[PDB]
Protein: D-threo-3-hydroxyaspartate dehydratase
Amino acid sequence: HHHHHHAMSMQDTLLTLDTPAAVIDLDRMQRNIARMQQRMDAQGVRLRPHVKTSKSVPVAAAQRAAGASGITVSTLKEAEQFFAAGTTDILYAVSMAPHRLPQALQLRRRGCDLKLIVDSVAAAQAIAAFGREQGEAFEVWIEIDTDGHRSGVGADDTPLLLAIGRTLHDGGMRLGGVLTHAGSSYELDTPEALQALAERERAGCVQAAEALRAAGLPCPVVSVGSTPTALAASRLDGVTEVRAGVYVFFDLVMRNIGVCAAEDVALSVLATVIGHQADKGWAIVDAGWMAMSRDRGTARQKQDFGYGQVCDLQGRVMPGFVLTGANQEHGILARADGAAEADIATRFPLGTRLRILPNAACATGAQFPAYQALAADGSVQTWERLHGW
Amino acid sequence: QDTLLTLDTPAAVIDLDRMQRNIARMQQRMDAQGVRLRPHVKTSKSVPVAAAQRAAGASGITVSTLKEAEQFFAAGTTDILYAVSMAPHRLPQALQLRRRGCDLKLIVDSVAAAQAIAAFGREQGEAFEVWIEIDTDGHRSGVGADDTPLLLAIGRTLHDGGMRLGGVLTHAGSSYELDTPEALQALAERERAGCVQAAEALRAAGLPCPVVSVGSTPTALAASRLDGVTEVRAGVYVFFDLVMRNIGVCAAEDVALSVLATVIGHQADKGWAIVDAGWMAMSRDRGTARQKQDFGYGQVCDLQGRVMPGFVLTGANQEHGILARADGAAEADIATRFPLGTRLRILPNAACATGAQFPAYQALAADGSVQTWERLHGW
Ligand SMILES: *Cc1c(COP(=O)(O)O)cnc(C)c1O
Ligand SMILES: *Cc1c(COP(=O)(O)O)cnc(C)c1O
Ligand SMILES: [Mg+2]
Ligand SMILES: [Mg+2]
Ligand SMILES: [Mg+2]
Structure:
């Protein structure tokens, strides 16, 4: 059995991978994918996962297989990659730059049903003029600011919403919907505050759609979501789809917001112990910030996990030990409480492998060309992901 | 031709005239000290950047991973120091590089790692070259500078084990917390002294120690004398960054890496311009937050590279940066100053962190044309 025997001899596990490596526990990932799709199905709304967390074709394929409708992307590079992989229904959810209009036009002309978003009269004018010149009715949604976080028209700003919506509609473009992202949910840590923010996000985005429609303008989609508000919303009246992406893996920021446990976290960075400073209680590992990223989202939350929570090779949290510091290719493993562990070298011998849970999975993942997707039998497979623009 | 007007954004642009001045400045300082410069390529991981460093007089390179050793060896560079405590599990990869003809040097700071190297080398018929890392300032790895028994035990393990004990090295990375010439000079002296002290203790015990290697970019530029030292290692100086400007070893105008970004909208009530360089372009590094002037997620410059003091990225989401006044006020009519589609260039907090976010740099020539210079990602 030639292929079998060769593949067996080539197969990696967590003991044979070189470190650092970004490992996806596939069973935890599938539980996360099921949980989010079940919740949206219960709310009677579509799920349009945001692939910026993974930028990985097989990850998005698992989201689609579970029932997802389309994807959200954060770059046109993502739109190109996932359209080539067979995803047609793609929302580019970053305010459209006019100079990217030729690439968006080429993606639509090759058969990608690519939606763009704007929040200004001038961006709507640019799209409509290019669309008229090029004989393309782009679909464009208007981004709404519901929580003061980032881009978007105020939900209560009827004159600007009308001006933008008329610019698109009069200009022969398809005004397809409104969207909002309540990213301020990341500053909360109670179920009450998260439920209230999810209600403000839904209410505001539906308010903007109702004002466009009261002026005779079409607005068939109402799209909301962050992972914390997707999991917290009690009701989604008026909403057609919810966008969420970090949930596929979760991370320690999400654990601190309270929408998951550390044991739901599916992404970890496999690392090796490469030295010590025994008098300071330090183990030095080969996962520095270039593996973890410089994200320190947990520093301002209820529990600071430094550059990440230490787990053993079986993925079980080792409470009390975190990466307290990080240089580029070296992480400093020590007690979070600030005590010097006695005998750090017997606790973590040279060559020991550990798995570090990330502050932010979106930021850790981008540091790696690929993930190693870990199956229940202990084998891994390389799953590429996209870097750059 | 491709230029700053035609590139998609965000893009990581190296101003070649600025890079070359940085290259010349460091090389000239190391010449004046009578030491070799072994640049640390972990800042750029880019073959043409290191080629310009070599053209100006650099001797060999330092790398932070064996993937960089593979890349630079495949491009013809053979004098490579891998300056991260060696993991025994990567010994097969190091061995294959040496057998292929790469003169790859490894480092250790423990008896156990030295025993692992020496046993594998004897079995494989390879006299690995290994330097001992010395801790001269409490920053990271290494044998304590006055820890002679540890030093000698590692040295004897290597040399009596049939390996080539090639040298000692230190990196005084605590230089990054300083911001005065006096304090940088004293740290550079402490770095030099402790590294030299270790070499002398090896030699006094009859062990070879031909290389004494020190450096960080701040201590390379601040050191008043380098007696006893054979080479200096420095990397971030090739581009500089705002961390370095705040340490005081360069000006913002010297920073040769910037991120070209387009204005994609505004929040006029807040005086924000939104740009398409978020933290995925800048990285999450916020090293200037702990220094005397905080530059947020980066210092704004105009398309010509003019620094615009007082505008910085005060915040950043993944693919959106928030450009606003550093003084906290709301710029009145921000959209009339920076209309949609305006291009700006952002100086990074940490050149090593921002560079790693991009698959390639755009190297900007005097005539305004660019050439793409790929760089390495991953392990
Ligand atoms: C990232 C993002 C999402 C998903 O939010 P998470 O909390 O990261 O899952 C949704 N919509 C927009 C516009 C996004 O940028
Ligand atoms: C990065 C590094 C250097 C170069 O110091 P910079 O201040 O970044 O130029 C030298 N030696 C070692 C061991 C390093 O890790
Ligand atoms: Mg995120
Ligand atoms: Mg491109
Ligand atoms: Mg650095």
Remarks:
- The two ends of chain A are 43 Å apart (CA to CA).
- The first strand of chain A starts at residue 21 and ends at 25.
- The CA atoms of residues 95 and 283 of chain A lie 44 Å apart.
- Chain A touches chain B through 57 residues (CB under 8 Å).
